[PDB]
Amino acid sequence: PYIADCPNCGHSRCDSPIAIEEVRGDAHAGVIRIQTSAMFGLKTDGVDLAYMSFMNGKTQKSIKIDNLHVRTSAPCSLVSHHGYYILAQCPPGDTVTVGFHDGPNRHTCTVAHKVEFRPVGREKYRHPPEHGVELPCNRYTHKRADQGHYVEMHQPGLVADHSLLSIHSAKVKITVPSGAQVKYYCKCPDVREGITSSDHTTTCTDVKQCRAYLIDNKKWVYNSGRLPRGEGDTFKGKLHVPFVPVKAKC
Amino acid sequence: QAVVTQESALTTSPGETVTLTCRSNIGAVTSSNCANWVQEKPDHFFTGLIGDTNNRRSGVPARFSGSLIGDKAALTITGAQTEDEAIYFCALWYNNLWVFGGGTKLTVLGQPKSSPSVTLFPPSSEELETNKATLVCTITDFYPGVVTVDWKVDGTPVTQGMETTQPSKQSNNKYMASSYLTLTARAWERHSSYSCQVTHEGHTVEKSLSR
Amino acid sequence: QIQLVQSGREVKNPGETVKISCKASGYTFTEYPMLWVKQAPGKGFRWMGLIYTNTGEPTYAEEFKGRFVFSLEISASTAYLQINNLTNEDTATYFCVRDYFISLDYWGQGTTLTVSSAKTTAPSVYPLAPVCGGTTGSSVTLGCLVKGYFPEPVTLTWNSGSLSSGVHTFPALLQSGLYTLSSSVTVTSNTWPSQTITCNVAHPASSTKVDKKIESRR
Q: Which of A137, B163, C134, C192 has a Cα at 20 to 30 A from A95?
């Protein structure tokens, strides 16, 4: 579940795991396909699409989806989630505004995007009716068994985590998640790369002049614009899109 | 240029859960302060318990755990024991130096009371050869650690000549103390009945010598 | 496993210098530096600084930059504290400590300094045997009175240290300008006076060593 910089995250620009990129109000059926940077779906391991894994800390939190809310000018209706990606039936709206409820906090994310829903037809409704003729609209699927396209999803770059840079009672003290690769030095001269377990820092003292980094590329990410490049390489991780636009007859 | 503050004293009973805290005068305590907890048992005996907020030193019972509660570092003793009665100090890191807290004296219910073991010795003779005589009254293994020692030469409460140390903690966690009554070779030979009276948790123990 | 054993306690008149050793055991000296802490009589615990036992660079707390100097006999796993131009308000106990696990994990025993003007007086060692009559119980308590010495410290053992169980040594106390110390030992009534029990006393400042066997009064 990637974490990026939401633009108007309740107050202002936070870093939400559900940071909204690639809003697509381009279909007709009241539907938008969205990508959160969060990867809900199965858990970390193997079970139940209808659970909920975002990033809290450096860490995931693969738990229940209980109180998702996509919304716009009005509250939307979820359609389905798969991967980083959710489909939801929305009305028109100047913006798009997404958010779940972890339980202790609202913890939402919101974004600008021009949305409309013309139905296909010479009638310019604002909303799909219960009746009328069927005719060839453009629309996204409910399903996941989907390969019609795939987007590049290679590694994450590093990320900041100054929870690492503690103090060794006079020196600034870095640690490691699980033996992950922490890329480290300070403005002063000390250890210059950092590919280590928990190091200390001989030279500098201040937490605010050091490289708290997490090269933790055991799991790839979506290639968000709000991602820092993993400078090393274009790793593999070509990964499908579920919600292909299909020729449904709305 | 930072002041760590800790509770002054806390009293608990064996089996209870007790929390000690460590507050920083500059702001909330955070993981970059690497809170350390150190225990001081009697005899200038130091051991480290927790480091880097929640890392338990090796061989420190699991009843001890550290954490950050609110804006402060905390030490929780889960199932406090009689053996945990000691002074706990917290230390906080501040980018370049360590600041220690004032320490919290923790008292834990336990160790059934124990009466003192009193012994009074006469001035040895090699010492009476110096024209001096010192009666030594030793008192060991008493708990609670508070006593009253009163000397009585020939039926009369001596009131000058005596010196009583301060109760010192033995290893078993009981206390000891000794009192000295210094006479002159001569004062010695004069009077005839010496007695060291020790009062402890209400009972009295009198140990008398006869010259 | 890890033992940091410190030098014994000194007495020094104002102006003097002291070198307190800390001999480390159980770890590789080089991967763990040393904390020097001052626990002043009333005041509580204070960090004096840290020495990088790898490079050798010391950090001093600002309170300690000046008269204090950390050094190390690397080679012997020793760290040392040296306090020069001793001030009278430096009486306190100094602990060495190992910095590890984002804090301090092991502390030493402490070396206590008593800065104090005074000459050198050897102690008088007196045996303390039970009263002239009877004394019949399952056990028996003997004693040893180390009277009138200066300065600190004295060391006291029983039977060269082979008899340590049932011993109470009482902290030295200053009386009329001199220190006095005492110790008791309790053994089964069959041990004494059948087997010899001896008080061993050393006063380093005067090069005085006294062995006093406890003899029955009659």
A: A137
Put simply, the answer to whether A170 touches C52 (Cβ < 8 Å) is: no
Chains that touch A (3 or more CB pairs under 8 A): B, C
d(CA C192, CA C197): 7
Resolution (A): 7.3
Strand bridging mode B72-78 / B55-56: unpaired
CA angle B5/B6/B9 to nearest 5° reads 145
Q: In 3-state terms, what secondary structure has residue B206?
A: strand
Q: CA distances (Å), A106 to each of A11, A100, A195, C56, in order?
A: 12, 7, 37, 52
Length of chain C: 218
Q: C touches which chains (3+ CB pairs under 8 A)?
A: A, B
- E strands in chain C: 3-6, 10-12, 18-25, 34-40, 44-51, 58-60, 68-73, 78-83, 92-100, 103-107, 111-115, 124-128, 139-149, 155-158, 167-175, 178-188, 198-203, 208-213
CB pairs under 8 A between A and B: 41
Q: Is B168 within 8 Å of C171 (Cβ atoms)?
A: yes
CA distances from B211 to B124, B133, B193, C56 (A): 12, 12, 7, 64
Question: Could you give the CA distance from residue B60 to residue B73 in angstroms, rounded to a whole number?
Answer: 18
Q: How many CA atoms lie within 13 A of B35 on its CB side?
A: 29
Q: Do C141 and B117 touch (CB under 8 A)?
A: yes
User: What does each C-alpha distance from A86 to A8, A31, A74, A79, C22 come to in angstroms?
Assistant: 20, 10, 17, 7, 64
Whether chain B has a CB inside 8 Å of the CB on A172: the answer is yes
Edge-first strand listing for the sheet containing A108-115: A69-71, A93-99, A108-115
- Per DSSP bridges, beta strands C10-12 and C111-115 are parallel
| Measured distance CA(C37)–CA(C57) in Å, rounded | 17
Nearest 5°: phi and psi at B31? -65, -10
Alpha-carbon dihedral A71, A72, A78, A84, rounded to 10 degrees: -80
Taking CB atoms and an 8 Å limit, are B36 and C128 in contact across chains?
Answer: no
- Test the C interface: residue of B138, B149, B195 with most C CBs within 10 Å: B138
Exposure string (b/e) for A133-171, b if CB count within 10 Å is 16 or more?
Answer: eeeebebbbeeeebeeeeeebbbbebbebeebbbbbbbb
- State whether C50 and A170 contact (CB < 8 Å): yes
Structural contact between residues B43 and B23, judged by C-beta atoms closer than 8 angstroms: no
Residue A17 near residue A2 (C-beta atoms within 8 A): yes
* Contact flag B91-A169 (C-beta cutoff 8 Å): yes
Q: How far apart are CA A6 and CA B150, in angstroms?
A: 79
Among the listed residues A243, C170, A177, A146, the one whose alpha carbon sits nearest the alpha carbon of residue B136: C170
| Interface residue ranges in chain B relative to chain A, Cβ cutoff 8 Å | 31-34, 36, 52, 91, 93-98
CA distances from B40 to A37, A83, B84, B156 (A): 50, 54, 10, 42
